Each structure stands twice: as structure tokens, then as C-alpha cells.
Amino acid sequence: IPSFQNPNDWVFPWLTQDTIQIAEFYEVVEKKETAFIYQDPVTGEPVS
Amino acid sequence: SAVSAVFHNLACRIAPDYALEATAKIIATAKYGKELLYKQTAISRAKRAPYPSRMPTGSGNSFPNLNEWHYFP
């Protein structure tokens, strides 16, 4: 039954029964990568 | 300062008992005197009553955090 702190108004010209919230956070890590080359045995083409 | 008013109003009221009626200076000072005693009171009672049931909350206002001013403020 999570919350954030309520983004919504506390004036409340109406009040809905449940409006319970959860926050999806996005953080950045570059990570990257290298190599990992293979061939395709299906109808030729190496260096995939 | 309340002395200078009252004794004129008092001397008028007990005058018919003595079969007399107050002179022009006594009734003039009596009315002007009691008016000066009420002068400070009528100044302090002046100020407009709170805003009506329907009044904007404005958008020139910065963060009022309320909608409607009813008899709220």
C-alpha cells in the first residue's frame, strides 16, 4: 500500500477512495561493452 | 476627560424635577461632550467585514494553497 507523499491537492473538491501512488525512478549508468563477435551458420555471413 | 461631558447631561435630566430647563450652553456641551467620549470608540469599530461566500482565490496570489475564499480568511 505505497505512497510517495501524495502529489495531489489536499484541498480536495472531491475525494476518491484510493489514489495510492508508486514512483518509477530512472537513473543512468553508461555500462557499455566490447567484442562478442560470432558467425551466422544460416545462409552464410560471418562477423555478426 | 469623561468628566467634562457627563455633568451637563446630568444637570439637564434632574432639571424638570426642580421645574427648570437647561440653557443653550449646557445642552450644546452635553451633546458635543458625549460625542468626544464616543469618538475613540467609533474609530475602533470601523473596518470592513470579511469577504463574501464567493470571492476568487486569484492567480496573482503566489502559493495560497487554497481554492475559494468563503469566510475562510
Swiss-Prot record, chain A:
Compartments in which it is found: Virion
Disulphide-bonded residues: none
Subunit structure: Homododecamer. Interacts with the terminase large subunit; this interaction allows the packaging of viral DNA. Interacts (via C-terminus) with the head-to-tail adapter protein gp4; this interaction participates in the head completion. Interacts with the scaffolding protein; this interaction initiates procapsid assembly, thereby ensuring incorporation of only one portal ring per capsid. Interacts with the capsid protein.
The protein's role, per its UniProt record: Forms the portal vertex of the capsid. This portal plays critical roles in head assembly, genome packaging, neck/tail attachment, and genome ejection. Procapsid assembly may initiate with a nucleation complex composed of portal and scaffolding proteins. The portal protein multimerizes as a single ring-shaped homododecamer arranged around a central channel. Switches upon genome packaging from an asymmetrical conformation in the procapsid (PC-portal) to a symmetrical ring in the mature capsid (MV-portal). This change of conformation may serve as a signal for headful packaging.
Family label: Belongs to the p22likevirus portal protein family.
Protein name: Portal protein
Species lineage: Viruses, Duplodnaviria, Heunggongvirae, Uroviricota, Caudoviricetes
The encoding gene: 1
Range covered out of full length: 198 to 245 of 725
Curated annotation (Swiss-Prot), chain B:
UniProt-recorded Gene Ontology molecular function terms: hydrolase activity
Key word Zinc present: no
GO cellular component: virus tail
Residues that span the membrane, as ranges: none
Cell compartment(s), UniProt: Virion
Highest taxon in the source lineage: Viruses
Keyword list, A-Z: Degradation of host cell envelope components during virus entry, Degradation of host peptidoglycans during virus entry, Hydrolase, Late protein, Lyase, Viral genome ejection through host cell envelope, Viral penetration into host cytoplasm, Viral short tail ejection system, Virion, Virus entry into host cell
GO BP annotations, alphabetical order: symbiont entry into host cell via disruption of host cell envelope; symbiont entry into host cell via disruption of host cell wall peptidoglycan; symbiont genome ejection through host cell envelope, short tail mechanism
Annotated domain remarks: The N-terminus changes its conformation when transitioning from the preassembly state to the postassembly state.
Functional description taken from the UniProt entry: Tail protein that binds the portal ring and functions as a head completion protein. 12 copies of gp4 form a structural ring at the bottom of the portal ring. Together with gp10 and gp26, gp4 is required for stabilization of the condensed DNA within the capsid; perhaps by plugging the hole through which the DNA enters. Plays a role in ejection of the bacteriophage DNA into the host cell at the initiation of infection. Functions as an exolysin that catalyzes the cleavage of the glycosidic bonds between N-acetylmuramic acid and N-acetylglucosamine residues in peptidoglycans.
Subunit architecture: Monomer; homododecamer upon binding to the portal ring. Interacts (via C-terminus) with the portal protein; this interaction participates in the head completion. Interacts with the Tail hub protein gp10. Interacts with the tail needle protein gp26.
Name of the protein: Head-to-tail adapter protein gp4
Residues of the full protein shown: 78 to 150 of 166
